[PDB]
Amino acid sequence: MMKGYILLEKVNIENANAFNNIIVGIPAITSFLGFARALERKLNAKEIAIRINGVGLEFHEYELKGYKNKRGQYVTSCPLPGSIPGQNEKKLDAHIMNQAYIDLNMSFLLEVEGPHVDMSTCKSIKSTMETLRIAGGIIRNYKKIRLIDTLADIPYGYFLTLRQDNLNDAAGDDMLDKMIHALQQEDTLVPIAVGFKALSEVGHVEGQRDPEKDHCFVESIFSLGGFECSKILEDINSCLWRYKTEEGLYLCTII
């Protein structure tokens, strides 16, 4: 209908999630694509049909909530737990679970295909990005929602692209050993959570959030990614994370 690219420039996320079972750092990519699909579903409910099918993930600044020890490691803080539903809900001190939190300044380049993609849609996103959360964190402020044309209006920042060929072509053993060897060879490469693989079959269990949609138990699957500057990014379309489904695999891929 009308393809285009909207950039949500310098979104300051406060206290997002950072724990994905073996990772403390950058949130999952399913969380940012969930911000995308939540923005899509709230715009499509103001009668603005816009199907978002590809998201760029640029990074300008971060602060993992904690401190850096003298030995150069990281200690992650947590808020004091309050009343947590359960058997011990009336006790004044609650149990502390595994949780990590991060602060990010990110810019999201979206691949938007709608009937009309104009600056009125940008105003709609501005009036829609102030009732949503990125990962599980609040948006303090955003710089500007603008339409971009090519890879020159994009601000300076370091994108996140999937580097699976640096993980398949690795030392040996099992995939964890390949990951550890690959992170030893390239020190500018990070583990990233990239989606889910089912542990059961599609069906109805009791306790679901929505009792009418299909349900499947999942593990998180993880891979490698790295950072590339905005200047040295070739034909965009390689920083655009997109949904991709298979039989048993719920994956986020850069094609």
Binding site: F19, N21, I22, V24, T30, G34, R37, Q73, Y74, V75, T76, C78, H95, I96, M97, N98, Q99, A100, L176, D177, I180, L183, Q184, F196, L199, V202, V205, Q208, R209, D210, K213, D214, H215, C216, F217, V218, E219, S220, Y243, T245, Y250
Partner: protein
């Protein structure tokens, strides 16, 4: 429990964490020098629980 896009519809995904993976990561990152963070959060009572 989270939603995931499957072909114009959605599938609810209730994520179960992996204990054995976390154990294998903790074994194979003590003997390594890649960036690593120790999560000193779970007490022994809740770990027993």
């Amino acid at each position: 429990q989270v939603f995931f896009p499957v072909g114009g519809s959605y599938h609810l995904l209730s994520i179960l964490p992996s204990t054995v993976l976390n154990y294998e990561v903790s074994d194979r990152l003590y003997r390594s020098k890649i960036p690593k963070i120790r999560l000193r959060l779970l007490s022994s009572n809740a770990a027993s629980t």
